[model samples]
Target: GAPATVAEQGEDITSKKDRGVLKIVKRVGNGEETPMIGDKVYVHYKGKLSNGKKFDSSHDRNEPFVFSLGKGQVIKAWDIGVATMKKGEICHLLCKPEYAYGSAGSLPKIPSNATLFFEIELLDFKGE
Candidate 1:
């Protein structure tokens, strides 16, 4: 029998050492502008479970999502993940439960202590 190798997705992802967060893939954007704390950010994202089942998507709705940076408007993973991105940038974030929904999880969609995946695109932002 021949040996077989199964490749893992995002094997080359960058790690945020202190946080255990991963940016699995990244696309450079034209602009240098990134959101700061308290800034209003406009974005589009697709969220999924580790097993590849989608839980939410702003793309399907044809509308961008908007929220304040570092303000608890979203999960901690998003606050950290999107903060590292710039306008027009797209990236994949791999989040541990602590940064996603935590112990209780978001009802009806996410499971308790679940790892999450997100493809996030930063559209625009305004500083506060």
Candidate 2:
């Protein structure tokens, strides 16, 4: 097994790299604009892998991805990513394993400790 320090360093590097990816994707927005903790939002999205492989899509399914921010109804990265977008804005969400499924991974295509990415569009928001 790796030493504790080594493991920490590895995880940190992975997180930083993932964040860098998210930073570029988020630049499509004016800047950082996190949503309120409990905002109801409607969004269109396409989920993909780091290699640009499409895994899921609301458009293909003929529906938008709608949910409440910070309700823990979805993955942590998604929950947090949506918080930064305004209505009609779009972004790409990149999440490392820790921010996503952690070391265990989600299911099917996601291997253990996988990283994820998503192209998201904020269609609407309601205070509800």
Candidate 3:
């Protein structure tokens, strides 16, 4: 059989600080002003494996995912990423393994030491 196309492939794995991950969608709705430690929020996102294969999404479902900023409700990277986004503004988050699942990696699919990308739109911020 022919090799898998880039769409089916995972992103090339590498550990270079110079590597940039987040790609902005430019919706210009509003930016979630850096969330606080206990604040609740809604976000729409598409999680992509390094190879560009989309693993999950809230955007495609036409909904927003709710979670806290720094409460471990999601992950450390989400805390860092969401804290910087402004309400109504959409932002993309590129997380290297160091800030993600780490060496042991996520179960079933996400590989050990894999880099992930998330297209996140800060939908709403609910006060703590």
Candidate 4:
């Protein structure tokens, strides 16, 4: 019902291995049965910059973003982070430049070296 608040780096849910690559916050959790790699995952995501400015939103588009998991169909952080989600989970992914667009940003939408925040709602998934 409300828009995203100010940019908060949030908590350190990332493991040692992930380190500076990505950080995840489980805003809403779900049951078991997380999707494996290659599953057709469906989700709705709201993308924001470090300043909490919205760049894009699947909700507004009225389309659930569908992608093949771990298949490089999306961003690097998404490849790794979405795979960690269980069915019906909703989470926020804090992505460093390395796990995201990196130094070479994606044109006007994303700035170079820009940190990203994504609120992702895992609608569902199924193996193909």
Candidate 5:
């Protein structure tokens, strides 16, 4: 039982660079620094499908997901999104098929071509 995506209250954080597959919206929280590649980043996230169905939530489970930025430990969206986050900031991500499960769509829970949204909190991180 997870909540729906948070309402938009922040500025669009999408880079003009696009990088081509994901979108980011930053609500607030500051630091000129984003995480570095090879850093072990920790975050809490609740993800919803395009249909608004909850498929996963680290917060609801009370555990932070830990993974190295850009290490392929997660989908491309997580790599890109978390890489841009400063410690303690919260951001919502719009991930497309090319950046996520794509054609396979993550099996039983996620369908083929499903787009997803993840409301994430950049909790903590450490150097790899």
Candidate 6:
């Protein structure tokens, strides 16, 4: 299957730089500002497996997801990955299971220890 959106592959945005676990596929913003801990973020996203099978999509659902930055409300990958993005930025996150659902996984769609992919668009956010 084809990607729902196109993005230019950028460097990894992980805690351990050069880990290849995450990448910024596209960027749009001042680049000087980014979300801080405790900030509320709004975003649209599409999640998929390595085989291009879509597991979830805020776009398809016609709604954006809202969460607090650096909070445990979302997957580990998202907490780190989204923080690196500025407002109006869009990026692709390549997440290993350790940063995702992990061993248990989200059943019925995600398998145990699966590698997942996500395209996230940062629509808006409110600072702490």
The TM-score leader among the candidates is 6
Q: Scored by CA lDDT, what does every candidate get?
A: 0.75, 0.66, 0.67, 0.77, 0.74, 0.79
Kindly report which residue stretches of model 5 are placed more than 4 angstroms away from their true locations once superposed: 1-26
Error of 5 at 65 (Å): 0.5
Q: What are the runs in model 1 whose C-alpha is more than 4 Å off?
A: 1-19
* Tens digits of per-residue lDDT for model 6, 13-124: 6666744356655767655688898999999999998568988899877999999998899988899888888888888877778888889999999999887888899998
Model 5 Cα shift for residue 49 (angstroms): 0.2
Off by over 4 Å in 2: 1-21, 25-34
Question: Model 6 off-target regions past 4 Å?
Answer: 1-10, 17-20
Using Cα atoms with residue i matched to residue i, what is each candidate's TM-score against the true structure?
0.83, 0.74, 0.74, 0.83, 0.81, 0.86
Query: Against the correct fold, how does model 1 do in TM-score?
Result: 0.83
| Clashing pairs in model 2, backbone N/Cα/C closer than 3 A | 34-83, 35-83
TM-score of 5: 0.81
Q: Tens digit of lDDT per residue, candidate 2, span 50-100?
A: 666677899987898888887998887777777767666776666677777
Q: On a 0 to 1 TM-score scale, where does candidate 4 land against the true structure?
A: 0.83
By TM-score: ranked, best first: 6, 1, 4, 5, 3, 2
Q: Give the TM-score of candidate 3.
A: 0.74
lDDT of 4 by residue, 10-125 (tens): 44444556433344555655667889999999999998887778899999979999999989988887887888888788877777788789999897999999878888889999
The best candidate by lDDT is 6
- List of clashing residue pairs for candidate 4: none
TM-score of 6: 0.86
Candidate 4, residue 117: the lDDT equals 82
